[PDB]
From a paper:
We next solved the ternary crystal structure of CRBNmidi in complex with PROTAC CFT-1297 and BRD4BD2 to a resolution of 2.9 Å. We chose compound CFT-1297 as a BET PROTAC degrader for crystallographic studies because it is reported to exhibit positive cooperativity of ternary complex formation, and was previously characterized by hydrogen-deuterium exchange mass spectrometry (HDX-MS), providing some low-resolution structural information. The crystal structure contains two protomers in the asymmetric unit, indicating flexibility in the ternary complex. The two protomers show a slightly different bound pose of the BRD4BD2 molecules relative to CRBN, caused by a tilt of 27° of the PROTAC around the piperidine moiety that connects the CRBN binder and the alkyl linker. The bromodomain docks sideways on top of the CRBN TBD, an orientation imposed by the long rigid alkyl linker of the PROTAC. The surface of the bromodomain most buried within the complex comprise the region from the end of the Z-helix to the middle of the ZA-loop, including the αZ’ helix from the ZA loop (residues 362–378). This region packs against the central linker region of the PROTAC at one end, and the CRBN TBD between the sensor loop and residues 390–396 at the other end, where a hydrogen bond is predicted between the side chains of Tyr372BRD4 and Gln390CRBN. The remainder of the ZA loop (residues 379–400) and the whole BC-loop are solvent-exposed within the ternary complex structure, as well as the Lon domain of CRBN which is also fully solvent-exposed. Additional protein-protein hydrophobic contacts are also observed as the C-helix of the bromodomain (residues 438–449) is found packed against CRBN at the opposite side of the TBD, with the side chains of Glu438BRD4 and Arg373CRBN at this interface located within a potential salt-bridge distance. Furthermore, by capturing two orientations of BRD4BD2 this crystal structure provides structural insight into complex flexibility that could be challenging to visualize by other techniques, such as cryoEM, in which flexibility can limit resolution.
Residue numbers in the entry:
A (entry chain B): 337 to 366, 369 to 458
B (entry chain A): 44 to 187, 250 to 266, 271 to 425
The structure:
């Protein structure tokens, strides 16, 4: 029940290869069928589930990743790919393998792995 | 085969895009063999036939600027027919006229949603890239059988159950747009200036028809020409646009095979009001062929009708 930092104020700023990551995010954001989960921060009171945040200490969502990509918070691409991978990994812990959400995430993770192999 | 409680007019109105749009009823028809300069849409790659309706949605700043100039001047833009989609090479095409326009500022980003109907066929003569990178094309307008319509209408009735136009040129285009054929045959029919030759070739093309499978793995037969039915006034194949801006040409069939349904039914952005969509994908390649539509009221006789994207199919 707390939003992750979308933009900082004291960090340095660099602009290299993060433009390519914006094209990757554009392919997943808009694929778009299963993007509406993991779009915005997971909402525990509306879902009724009062155990999600206790199971997953770190909250990562596509929109948070987008806001950090615009304020140039990331100085290295690795931190982004780690954050995207963390979003998928968290889903696989709370949800069982037969759940549809686990099937949705797999398709996105396949697209993400394909596009992140054309790094410049 | 079943009765229809659905209103064929509601899908044509395109309520999903909006409802309070400005309407232009003026019509402009250039003279045959005249030469004209027409700007082209940068993202469209479909092959439009005269009388077909194109729903559009544009986000990019260079694109809204062209639409605003078009409304002030003659409201006409060109949609080309490319032999290779990746390439920008084209030879023929059809003009499109905006009859509906709406501007919207969503979160500070200017949004235009327009609806246009194709008017006249043309031949590309030259295409230069504008200073803003939005190519303008110099083209030349191209000039343009009761027993024949009978045989076509007879066979068409065998495929599915006065909806068809009565005029010759109007009937030829209807068949060409709604036939389950390859886009190579669409270009060939467009190149045919006369209506008589076009109707005779449509009869030959429809008699020999093949089933459709998925384009990615080409291993699962999806549907046949006998399962086709028309849920809209335009016909079985009509064009609809998704919220992000990509236009889909959807084929409405009554039954399909080899497709698994993922998720729960939802009504958000439903191209057919009154119905809910569930994503369907191939059991081999998992290519997300189309969406299956489930009704929300028990009074609608077509409770379930499939909706397939033409882009993911290839005739066998
Ligand atoms: C993350 C996480 N991790 N675990 C969980 N979640 C979750 C998080 C959030 C939510 C949630 C619930 N509600 N909302 C509330 C958030 C809801 C956001 C809005 C969702 C609907 N809009 C997006 C999809 C649509 C769209 C988009 C792109 C293209 C096209 C279309 C439609 N479309 C076509 C389709 C065909 C057609 O006819 N027309 C079209 O336009 C397209 O071309 C547009 C409408 C969000 C649930 C979950 C779930 C979950 C998810 C799904 C399901 Cl079945 C079951 C459970 N499970 C958990 C708790 C364990
Ligand atoms: Zn397949």
């Amino acid at each position: 029940d707390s939003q992750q930092h979308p933009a900082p104020e004291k960090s340095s700023k660099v602009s290299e290869q993060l433009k390519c990551c914006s094209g990757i995010l554009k392919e997943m954001f808009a694929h778009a069928a299963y993007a509406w989960p993991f779009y915005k921060p997971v909402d525990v009171e509306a879902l009724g589930l009062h155990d999600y945040c206790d199971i997953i200490k770190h909250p990562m969502d596509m929109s948070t990743i987008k806001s950090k990509l615009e304020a140039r918070e990331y100085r290295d691409a690795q931190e982004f790919g780690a954050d995207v991978r963390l979003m998928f990994s968290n889903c696989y812990k709370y949800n069982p393998p037969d759940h549809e959400v686990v099937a949705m995430a797999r398709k996105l993770q396949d697209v993400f792995e394909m596009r992140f192999a054309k790094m410049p | 085969p079943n009765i229809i409680n659905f209103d064929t007019s509601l899908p044509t109105s395109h309520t999903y895009l909006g409802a309070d749009m400005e309407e232009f009823h003026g019509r402009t028809l250039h003279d045959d063999d005249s030469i004209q300069v027409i700007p082209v849409l940068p993202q469209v790659m479909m092959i439009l036939v005269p009388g077909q309706t194109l729903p559009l949605q544009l986000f990019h700043p260079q694109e809204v600027s062209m639409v605003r100039n078009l409304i002030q001047n003659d409201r006409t833009f060109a949609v080309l027919a490319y032999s290779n989609v990746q390439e920008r090479e084209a030879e023929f095409g059809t003009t499109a006229e905006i009859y509906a326009y709406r501007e919207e500022q969503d979160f500070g980003i200017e949004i235009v949603k327009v609806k246009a109907i194709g008017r006249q066929r043309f031949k590309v003569l030259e295409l230069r890239t504008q200073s803003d990178g939005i190519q303008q094309a110099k083209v030349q307008i191209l000039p343009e059988a009761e027993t024949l319509m009978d045989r076509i209408k007879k066979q068409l009735r065998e495929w599915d159950e006065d909806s068809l136009p009565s005029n010759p040129i109007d009937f030829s285009y209807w068949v060409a747009a709604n036939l389950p054929i390859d886009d190579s045959l669409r270009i060939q029919l467009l190149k045919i200036d006369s209506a008589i030759q076009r109707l005779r070739c449509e009869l030959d093309i429809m008699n020999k028809c093949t089933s459709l499978c998925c384009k990615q793995c080409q291993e699962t037969e999806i549907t046949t020409k006998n399962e086709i039915f028309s849920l809209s006034r335009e016909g079985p194949m009509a064009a609809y646009v998704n919220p992000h801006g990509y236009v889909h040409e959807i084929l409405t069939v009554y039954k399909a095979c080899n497709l698994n349904l993922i998720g729960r039914p939802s009504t958000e952005h439903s191209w057919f009001p009154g119905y809910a969509w569930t994503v369907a994908q191939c059991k081999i390649c998992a290519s997300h062929i189309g969406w299956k539509f489930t009704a929300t009221k028990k009074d609608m006789s077509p409770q379930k009708f499939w909706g397939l994207t033409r882009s993911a199919l290839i005739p066998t």
